[PDB]
């Protein structure tokens, strides 16, 4: 595919799920070879793994004293639409969470794609690889297309579910929202996070209940979201990815570990 | 024969003979039933006659405001190798002319053919047909194989030459370059074309001289090229062709006229 950027500036604003603070984004067009990067207080933070600074409950990037929290959803949408050249100006310390999914980003960006004059230089998984961490495990192997499968094992009604994304099924994961269990809310809050969470941007699940009045968008909405999160984390490789991934109970922390592993293998 | 596509992306770049502009192609694999089509600025332009928009000095395709010039050489090579399913991404407004023949295309694609699971549904000439135009004439009649004969009558040393291609002799026409007579250079340039022509991609012939220091690749290189051009134009029928063709002084304009004639006869 050809490198892409946006036709014109696109902006989004709202509260950040973790900081509880208001913030805004302005996605700026860029020319071939630029890549995806953020801009905050006069500092450019490339959307690459070398700049990750936190992976608990979100993926945060930082550089020269400037940090930006929760870049996973905007990067996932960008990865899925294959937007390769843009500068994401950030007014705040975190990306707006919006409704908790990538729907708003997806719809806006989708109808503003501008093809450019350069073939995408995809990051291609050359050989099989596995990363583990106390039960959690992610596996990557060669593939002509981006295929991501996530298998979750929850200690609640969700039980054991798995979902597979394949190129062309973008619309099946871009509406899946971020979720949290009532029993982990005190922790998240205690550790300085989740200050902006609500039933309006987060799916709260109990041992056998769903607090959101609207319920689940899909019976397996949670693993679809995990797939969504992983697509965004994979974009930290620097360019659109081509490979087959299988994540069992993975999180941002393991996703990033896998990313640095693939990167290390100068792939 | 079975439908074919390429094993992996193949790319070519260089100047376009007419625009003088730089451009690049990326031939992408496609699955059974796809067909041959171009991709430019988010628009798919099928390699079919309905999309022809210009036939003077090259065959150009267009759709939804997106145009691509000089598709004859890449389509001819594709037709000859029987590549039936690919998307030709185009970065520019014209296919790179390269050395003026189909050699580079032929060599690369040839060693990257991927047979697929479907029998080719060839376009078969069912009944005799003739198209004329002030001296020029093309005749088509049934045949189990693709046989193309071109007879040229030049007002220079070339005189009257004819060449016949038959399945299996692909390598005899894929090196024949595009040619031009010095007395027509001012015209071509005057009408906005030929901006990228040079002795490096075009064979320039005089009333009795050959400007290229390397000379002709064959004493009848020009009619071999015409045969080459006609093979490419015939592919605009939508699928590999089976028929016996005889062209006397034909050009892209008449080739296309014949194509639309055969197509009209819902053949
Ligand atoms: O197979 C799985 C995958 C995730 N989770 C839970 O999903 C919630 C989300 O947090 P996680 O540890 O996955 O980190 P994140 O993706 O937010 O970085 C946590 O409470 C996990 O224990 C689970 O129970 N089973
Ligand atoms: O039997 C022939 C066939 C072609 N030509 C010349 O070949 C050159 C190529 O131009 P053409 O009209 O064939 O255009 P094209 O095939 O590029 O559409 C022109 O100068 C023609 O007059 C010729 O002299 N005798
Ligand atoms: C489980 C993984 C992570 C992402 C963090 C989700 C945000 C946690 C915030 C808890 C939301 C609680 C909903 C009620 C808030 C309110 O009524 O103000
Ligand atoms: C008839 C169809 C074709 C288009 C061919 C492109 C024309 C450009 C030719 C190259 C120009 C070379 C200039 C030098 C002239 C000379 O040495 O006589
Ligand atoms: Zn491409
Ligand atoms: Zn924590
Ligand atoms: Zn979490
Ligand atoms: Zn997250
Ligand atoms: Zn998320
Ligand atoms: Zn003309
Ligand atoms: Zn011509
Ligand atoms: Zn031509
Ligand atoms: Zn030609």
Bound molecules: uridine-5'-diphosphate, palmitic acid, zinc ion
The top level CATH class name of the largest domain in chain A: Alpha Beta
Distance between the termini of chain A: 19 Å
SSE succession of chain A:
EEEEEEEEHEHEEEEEEEHEHEH
Classify the helix fraction of chain A into a percent range.
10-25%
Structural class of chain A: alpha+beta
Pfam family, one (chains A, B): LpxC
Family (chains A, B): Belongs to the LpxC family.
Organism (chains A, B): Aquifex aeolicus (strain VF5)
Catalytic activity (chains A, B): a UDP-3-O-[(3R)-3-hydroxyacyl]-N-acetyl-alpha-D-glucosamine + H2O = a UDP-3-O-[(3R)-3-hydroxyacyl]-alpha-D-glucosamine + acetate
In short:
The PDB classes it as hydrolase. Keywords: alpha + beta fold, hydrolase. The structure is a homodimer of 267-residue chains. Chain A has 267 residues and is an alpha+beta fold.
Give a written overview of the molecule.
- The structure is a homodimer of 267-residue chains.
- The first copy, chain A, is 19% helix and 35% strand.
- Chain A is α+β, with helices and mostly antiparallel strands.
- Chain A has two domains: 1-121, 2-Layer Sandwich (Ribosomal Protein S5, domain 2), CATH 3.30.230.20; 122-267, lpxc deacetylase, domain 2 (lpxc deacetylase, domain 1).
- In chain A, strands 11, 12, 13, 14, 15 and 18 form a six-stranded mixed beta sheet that branches.
- In chain A, helix 3 links the parallel strand 16 and strand 17 (203-205).
- In chain A, helix 1 (72-81) packs parallel to helix 2, helix 1 (72-81) packs across helix 4 (221-234) and helix 4 packs parallel to helix 5.
- The longest helix of chain A is centred in the C-terminal third of the chain and has 14 residues, at 221-234.
- Chains A and B meet through strand 10 of A and strand 3 of B.
- Bound molecules: uridine-5'-diphosphate (2 copies), palmitic acid (2 copies) and zinc ion (ZN) (9 copies).
- The site of one zinc ion has 5 residues of chain B, from loops.
